[PDB]
Amino acid sequence: EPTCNTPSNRACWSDGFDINTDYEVSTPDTGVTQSYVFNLTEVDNWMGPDGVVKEKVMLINGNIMGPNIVANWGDTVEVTVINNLVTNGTSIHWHGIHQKDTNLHDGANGVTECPIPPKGGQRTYRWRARQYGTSWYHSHFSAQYGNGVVGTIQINGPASLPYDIDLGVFPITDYYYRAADDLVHFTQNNAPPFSDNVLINGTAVNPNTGEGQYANVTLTPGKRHRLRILNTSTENHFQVSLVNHTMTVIAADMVPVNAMTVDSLFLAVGQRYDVVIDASRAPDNYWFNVTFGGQAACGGSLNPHPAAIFHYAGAPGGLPTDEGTPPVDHQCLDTLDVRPVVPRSVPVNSFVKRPDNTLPVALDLTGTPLFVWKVNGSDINVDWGKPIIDYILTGNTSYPVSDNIVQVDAVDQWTYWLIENDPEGPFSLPHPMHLHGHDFLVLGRSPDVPAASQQRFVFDPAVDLARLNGDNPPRRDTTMLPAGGWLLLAFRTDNPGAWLFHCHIAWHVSGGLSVDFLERPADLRQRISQEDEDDFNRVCDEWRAYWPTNPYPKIDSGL
Amino acid sequence: EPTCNTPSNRACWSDGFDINTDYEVSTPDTGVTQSYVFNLTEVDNWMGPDGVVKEKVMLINGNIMGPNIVANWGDTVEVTVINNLVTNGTSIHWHGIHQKDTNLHDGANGVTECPIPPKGGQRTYRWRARQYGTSWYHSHFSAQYGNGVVGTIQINGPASLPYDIDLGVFPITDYYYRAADDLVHFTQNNAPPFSDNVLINGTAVNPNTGEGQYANVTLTPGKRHRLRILNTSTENHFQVSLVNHTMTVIAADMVPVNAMTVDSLFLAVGQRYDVVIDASRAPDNYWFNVTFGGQAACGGSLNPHPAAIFHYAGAPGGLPTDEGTPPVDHQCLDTLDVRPVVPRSVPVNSFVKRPDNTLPVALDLTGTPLFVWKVNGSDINVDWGKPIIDYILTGNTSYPVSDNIVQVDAVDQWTYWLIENDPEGPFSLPHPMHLHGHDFLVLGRSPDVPAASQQRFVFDPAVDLARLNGDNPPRRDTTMLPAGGWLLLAFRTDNPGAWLFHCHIAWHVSGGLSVDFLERPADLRQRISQEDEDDFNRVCDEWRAYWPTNPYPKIDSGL
Numbered sequence A, B: 001e002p003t004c005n006t007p008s009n010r011a012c013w014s015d016g017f018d019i020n021t022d023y024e025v026s027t028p029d030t031g032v033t034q035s036y037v038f039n040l041t042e043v044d045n046w047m048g049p050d051g052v053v054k055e056k057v058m059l060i061n062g063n064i065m066g067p068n069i070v071a072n073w074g075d076t077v078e079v080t081v082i083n084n085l086v087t088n089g090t091s092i093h094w095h096g097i098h099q100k101d102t103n104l105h106d107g108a109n110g111v112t113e114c115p116i117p118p119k120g121g122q123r124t125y126r127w128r129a130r131q132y133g134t135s136w137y138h139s140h141f142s143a144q145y146g147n148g149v150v151g152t153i154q155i156n157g158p159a160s161l162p163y164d165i166d167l168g169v170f171p172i173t174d175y176y177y178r179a180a181d182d183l184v185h186f187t188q189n190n191a192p193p194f195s196d197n198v199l200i201n202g203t204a205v206n207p208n209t210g211e212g213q214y215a216n217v218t219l220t221p222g223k224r225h226r227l228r229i230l231n232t233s234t235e236n237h238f239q240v241s242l243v244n245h246t247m248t249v250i251a252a253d254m255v256p257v258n259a260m261t262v263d264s265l266f267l268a269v270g271q272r273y274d275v276v277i278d279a280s281r282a283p284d285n286y287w288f289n290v291t292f293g294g295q296a297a298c299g300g301s302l303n304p305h306p307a308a309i310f311h312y313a314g315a316p317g318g319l320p321t322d323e324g325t326p327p328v329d330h331q332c333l334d335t336l337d338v339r340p341v342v343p344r345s346v347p348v349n350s351f352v353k354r355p356d357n358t359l360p361v362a363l364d365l366t367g368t369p370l371f372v373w374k375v376n377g378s379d380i381n382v383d384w385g386k387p388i389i390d391y392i393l394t395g396n397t398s399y400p401v402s403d404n405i406v407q408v409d410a411v412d413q414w415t416y417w418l419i420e421n422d423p424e425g426p427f428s429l430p431h432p433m434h435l436h437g438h439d440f441l442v443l444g445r446s447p448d449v450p451a452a453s454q455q456r457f458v459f460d461p462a463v464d465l466a467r468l469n470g471d472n473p474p475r476r477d478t479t480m481l482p483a484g485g486w487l488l489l490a491f492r493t494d495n496p497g498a499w500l501f502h503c504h505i506a507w508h509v510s511g512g513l514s515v516d517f518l519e520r521p522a523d524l525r526q527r528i529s530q531e532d533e534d535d536f537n538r539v540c541d542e543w544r545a546y547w548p549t550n551p552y553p554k555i556d557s558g559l
């Protein structure tokens, strides 16, 4: 609970807690639990928000998105998930929530848990809100979240700028009429489709029929509004802009940053930005536009102009009349100009590329199916019925090759990872890389070039060491791996657990694009509570009893 | 020679010859020959127009482009080509010149001739200018034209609008620092690169160093100017526009059309447009912008804003100050709104899709090299030392499978061709299809959609017959096959000969994307003069003697 967070002083929170507190090591002790129940159901012939009926969706509590989780910094969040799907298992991952010493609540099926079985299986997740800001949750059972198993998280806390009104969450997502499993199958042998539409806060107009509605955000004239923008897509990467208005970024993913004013923002799959918008213009209706850059390298939609309306209270109704100017093309790249409020510094002039710190991403066309993604020579394929944690609990170190284990034994040390984007392959695509259990530092990437140009870069220390930044670089949970290039990341090994690190494009992680960082496995075993172990075993027993009865095969990585 | 062609009456030409004359069957007898000599040399470490030195170019008469060929309607054009290259053969194709009953002058090596050998080989081409308008010529010896063996053709004649000043030719081309053979090799196993620059009428500024010059066109205030725009690229497809001005199309390729005013034009590789521009704006300097659409599906450049300067005579010098607005995205499609002055009419209701009128294009990834393009199951591969004409002249009908012969015996009849763009492949690209020996009618294509959307269409008579147009449809020599879709063309068998029909993206035809229409072969043999036969055999004898001594292999289709 806050005691001194006001519109003119958003920096403050409570005694000993403010915007400069190192939230990674210090958390308010509130004693409060916010609980939720997620009832997952399978709905056929569901009428979506743009008027088109979908074959099948999988919904939490009967809505397009699950409950908007809301709590205060230091609260505990507890969610009982009840799987009433017909065939699919499920596992809810809390994206952006680092699960400090709570790895078994990460929701990574095949890694930290077996899936919750259908026809009534249940599991209760319980995690501490040790970071404030805007995050989201979604199923990690193959590409199930593309069917509807997705929602938002708002953990309240201090901010790096004053503002008057918190508009709350604003999820933006691609929308397909085909079901997720259909699309996984299709993308195994075909380039992925454009989205049929892009929903903004749950709604959109159909570009063909005009059915549906624009999201409509009412701004209070003269007021400063915090808007929490998310990209909850399966594939599309968005540029966003508001006609005649700037946006001032105050957080990236769940990391507060120094205020940064911009005309447009790029959001990768899984990324979030908290912005402050001043309703300082003439009262009127203004378009909030979703647009695509990078010449389709990171998505497109069959709706040519997905948009929301921002309406000044007391202005006339109807639609905006100013179409605006197109934003700069972001070329499928997130900005590296954001600077966290609470700083980190690491050396970069000692980095040496080696097999054991390099992660070569490659598209392998030689097998079946056609599109298989490999990291360091292997496409990930996890065992839903024998998760990595089962090996840990049984003291078995014979991890299958397909689990793509990268064991990291270093204790609370900075570790450096060079990710290489198929620089020798026939073609390369941008990939939104996402790390569980940690924020990483973005130390640098290959030079910014047009995303579709097929220019390639291999890390060359004689030119590239000088291009790295270890002095409070961007810190977050998702960032772009440039088409044909490389990305250098660091994270500190402060959190024993098995942590996925994967491209967040659904089709690609389905197709194998992940590794699993096994961080300090010796320490992990000691820190698993009897309750967590017992419940892990309970759910695994039920899943293993269920699986033989499933009418459908597993067709992908499981992730 | 014209006798009544004036600025106020461009429709007139001479007695019995005007804009309405069927130029496909009636030609002025002028008795004039315009002759040229093309001396091809190989130049290492050549300074190009943007300040960058290229490893190797292949030039006609020591210049970036060969002679502008200029003649009148009904003149004869004669060109002696002398091949002073070190290793390569050569063969000059006159793109847009239909070569009516002069098939052996078409310059298609492996089809209508053997290549002219290096170290001083020579051959004289002679053709009747039976069409007026703007065309171009280029080597057809693999992708050699990408090294510099390229130039323009202007055959004067009447026009569909009055105008004051003929500004002449304005070729626009992609420009690569890498030589053509290196790019063929690269594109056999890799997606093609963006161009390093785009030259406009021979020049460009370097996007990195600022070296070079903008093309500078001086407009006479209040005057109507004809500008002859061409795309002489190896791969890039261009959108063009002039800030604050419209352009009125008066011809498409070599076909005069009813005046059509537009804000921007899409030019496929090998396409031409004659436009009339009125200098009716405020006297100033205006940008002529080259832009890319279709989400990089039909090319891009590492120069983000290639442009030329249009200067009003009497205005200040220096650079334009208005950046203007981006044109409509043409989505890699030429317009089907053009309507030829001299009409043609064919039935479309009666078309039935059959194997013998369908040309399925496919990318085959299963062989060596990776990218091989096949039409109706076969990647074309010509024999430079045994051209199709050699088979004709020796009465040999055992054409190799790889010559992709489509024999068309119909005498002077309309023939209908459905080209299908790999609708069941994993990934499809737009292709600029070009026919030798004829203009074709563009009867229809699959629905216009975003080029990178990967939406696929298979011809369906129940919906598509109604979407065809046989009432004076666009008529020209090059048009776009839509990504993932289909294109229906028609041509009349009025010209016996062996005629290539191929994608004009150099990398694609090199990789096999062509067929060879063998039109009325019996009539063809009857029509070959003893002079044409003796000279064909002469060059073949020389080429065949040369080839065993060549130090390099043939690594592609030969075309």
Ligand SMILES: *[C@@H]1O[C@H](CO)[C@@H](O[C@@H]2O[C@H](CO)[C@@H](O[C@@H]3O[C@H](CO[C@H]4O[C@H](CO)[C@@H](O)[C@H](O)[C@@H]4O)[C@@H](O)[C@H](O)[C@@H]3O)[C@H](O)[C@H]2NC(C)=O)[C@H](O)[C@H]1NC(C)=O
Pocket: A055, A056, A087, A088, A089, A179, A180, A181, A182, A550, A552, A553, A554, A555
């Ligand atoms: C999780 O639950 C999902 C929802 O029930 C399961 O997805 C189903 O999985 C099966 C088996 O993989 C699919 O069946 C195959 O579908 C293809 C394509 O059929 C569809 O599309 C074509 C072409 O447009 C159309 O003609 C059909 O009407 C379908 O709409 C067929 O060709 C195959 O023969 C086969 O039937 C289902 O399509 C798929 N359903 C959906 C809605 O995604 C999934 O398997 C479950 N996962 C697990 C691990 O239990």
Ligand SMILES: *[C@@H]1O[C@H](CO)[C@@H](O[C@@H]2O[C@H](CO)[C@@H](O[C@@H]3O[C@H](CO[C@H]4O[C@H](CO)[C@@H](O)[C@H](O)[C@@H]4O)[C@@H](O)[C@H](O)[C@@H]3O)[C@H](O)[C@H]2NC(C)=O)[C@H](O)[C@H]1NC(C)=O
Pocket: B055, B056, B087, B088, B089, B179, B180, B181, B182, B550, B552, B553, B554, B555
């Ligand atoms: C027509 O004349 C052309 C001009 O001489 C001939 O083109 C040459 O063809 C040869 C044989 O294929 C090429 O040699 C190959 O080059 C590749 C790639 O080398 C590249 O990379 C190195 C550095 O890594 C660089 O030094 C080069 O410049 C290239 O960029 C090699 O991997 C092969 O082993 C082989 O050497 C020539 O590169 C190519 N030259 C040019 C300028 O294009 C062509 O073969 C002639 N055609 C015929 C049929 O006679």
Ligand SMILES: *[C@@H]1O[C@H](CO)[C@@H](O[C@@H]2O[C@H](CO)[C@@H](O[C@@H]3O[C@H](CO)[C@@H](O)[C@H](O)[C@@H]3O)[C@H](O)[C@H]2NC(C)=O)[C@H](O)[C@H]1NC(C)=O
Pocket: A287, A288, A289, A290, A291, A305, A306, A307, A319, A320, A323, A324, A325, A326, A327
């Ligand atoms: C922001 O989003 C808005 C709303 O989607 C966009 O407005 C739309 O702009 C397009 C393109 O200019 C308009 O379509 C055009 O309609 C006219 C008919 O008047 C027609 O000439 C064209 O063929 C074209 O289809 C569309 O009317 C308009 N939508 C609405 C509801 O006003 C706007 O372009 C977006 N701005 C940016 C910078 O992305």
Ligand SMILES: *[C@@H]1O[C@H](CO)[C@@H](O[C@@H]2O[C@H](CO)[C@@H](O[C@@H]3O[C@H](CO)[C@@H](O)[C@H](O)[C@@H]3O)[C@H](O)[C@H]2NC(C)=O)[C@H](O)[C@H]1NC(C)=O
Pocket: B287, B288, B289, B290, B291, B305, B306, B307, B319, B320, B323, B324, B325, B326, B327
């Ligand atoms: C038509 O072609 C011209 C000439 O290439 C284009 O003008 C160029 O426009 C770009 C984009 O606005 C300018 O680049 C920008 O410059 C500013 C200021 O230096 C810089 O802050 C940006 O980072 C960016 O580099 C460029 O100055 C300008 N070129 C010149 C010589 O004036 C124009 O955009 C084209 N128009 C269309 C519709 O394509």
Ligand SMILES: *[C@@H]1O[C@H](CO)[C@@H](O[C@@H]2O[C@H](CO)[C@@H](O)[C@H](O)[C@H]2NC(C)=O)[C@H](O)[C@H]1NC(C)=O
Pocket: A167, A168, A169, A170, A201, A202, A216, A217, A218
């Ligand atoms: C996003 O859409 C939701 C719809 O759920 C909006 O939340 C509703 O807002 C209206 C008006 O303020 C209230 O009557 C409802 O009680 C709200 N519903 C819920 C479930 O919270 C929300 O305002 C939208 N966000 C923005 C920024 O416009």
Ligand SMILES: *[C@@H]1O[C@H](CO)[C@@H](O[C@@H]2O[C@H](CO)[C@@H](O)[C@H](O)[C@H]2NC(C)=O)[C@H](O)[C@H]1NC(C)=O
Pocket: A216, A217, A218, A309, A311, A312, A313, A314, A315, A316, A317, A318, A319
């Ligand atoms: C967006 O929402 C607002 C409600 O906040 C609507 O604004 C009202 O519009 C009506 C007329 O349409 C006016 O009578 C009211 O006075 C407006 N209220 C406020 C608070 O300003 C607006 O119409 C909505 N826009 C759309 C497209 O539905």
Ligand SMILES: *[C@@H]1O[C@H](CO)[C@@H](O[C@@H]2O[C@H](CO)[C@@H](O)[C@H](O)[C@H]2NC(C)=O)[C@H](O)[C@H]1NC(C)=O
Pocket: A355, A356, A357, A358, A359, A376, A405, A406
């Ligand atoms: C990627 O795979 C290679 C194997 O090809 C790994 O390289 C080995 O790493 C181990 C452990 O550090 C060393 O003991 C060996 O010397 C390496 N073998 C070779 C052939 O170099 C590499 O560690 C893997 N990288 C990651 C990050 O997982």
Ligand SMILES: *[C@@H]1O[C@H](CO)[C@@H](O[C@@H]2O[C@H](CO)[C@@H](O)[C@H](O)[C@H]2NC(C)=O)[C@H](O)[C@H]1NC(C)=O
Pocket: B216, B217, B218, B309, B311, B312, B313, B314, B315, B316, B317, B318, B319
């Ligand atoms: C484009 O060409 C025109 C015509 O040569 C140049 O126009 C001259 O500009 C100078 C000033 O630089 C004047 O003194 C002349 O009187 C102009 N001539 C005419 C006929 O208008 C122009 O400078 C060139 N532009 C560029 C960018 O070099």
Ligand SMILES: *[C@@H]1O[C@H](CO)[C@@H](O[C@@H]2O[C@H](CO)[C@@H](O)[C@H](O)[C@H]2NC(C)=O)[C@H](O)[C@H]1NC(C)=O
Pocket: B355, B356, B357, B358, B359, B376, B405, B406
């Ligand atoms: C494409 O290839 C197919 C297969 O070789 C050709 O189809 C044959 O055409 C002949 C002549 O009409 C028929 O007698 C055969 O029945 C066809 N065979 C099959 C398997 O259908 C077809 O003609 C080729 N098309 C073109 C345009 O060259």
Ligand SMILES: COc1cc(Oc2c(OC)cccc2OC)cc(OC)c1O
Pocket: A190, A191, A192, A296, A297, A298, A299, A363, A371, A427, A429, B191, B426, B427
């Ligand atoms: C791996 O699957 C894909 C294939 C694509 O198609 C190709 C392409 O198009 C951009 C260019 C070159 C090769 C491609 O693969 C067949 C494009 C994709 O991007 C959305 C893509 O994800």
Ligand SMILES: *[C@@H]1O[C@H](CO)[C@@H](O)[C@H](O)[C@H]1NC(C)=O
Pocket: A039, A040, A041, A062, A082, A084
């Ligand atoms: C889940 O929701 C369905 C549909 O509303 C309902 O019938 C069922 O009882 C719910 N089950 C649980 C455990 O909440």
Ligand SMILES: *[C@@H]1O[C@H](CO)[C@@H](O)[C@H](O)[C@H]1NC(C)=O
Pocket: A386, A394, A396, A397, A398, A399, A400
């Ligand atoms: C250890 O795990 C491997 C791989 O799953 C398995 O085959 C083996 O039997 C396990 N051993 C024990 C003792 O559990």
Ligand SMILES: *[C@@H]1O[C@H](CO)[C@@H](O)[C@H](O)[C@H]1NC(C)=O
Pocket: B039, B040, B041, B062, B082, B084
């Ligand atoms: C061709 O040009 C070269 C270089 O200019 C010259 O030396 C040579 O003599 C010319 N050959 C002929 C036959 O024109």
Ligand SMILES: *[C@@H]1O[C@H](CO)[C@@H](O)[C@H](O)[C@H]1NC(C)=O
Pocket: B167, B168, B169, B170, B201, B202, B216, B217, B218
């Ligand atoms: C093109 O360049 C040529 C030669 O450099 C020049 O004579 C001609 O005027 C230019 N054409 C135009 C339209 O500017």
Ligand SMILES: *[C@@H]1O[C@H](CO)[C@@H](O)[C@H](O)[C@H]1NC(C)=O
Pocket: B386, B394, B395, B396, B397, B398
């Ligand atoms: C046709 O040409 C091939 C290749 O040169 C030859 O082997 C064959 O004998 C020729 N047949 C006839 C009928 O001349």
Ligand SMILES: [Cl-]
Pocket: A094, A095, A096, A097, A098, A435, A436, A437, A438, A477
């Ligand atoms: Cl996470």
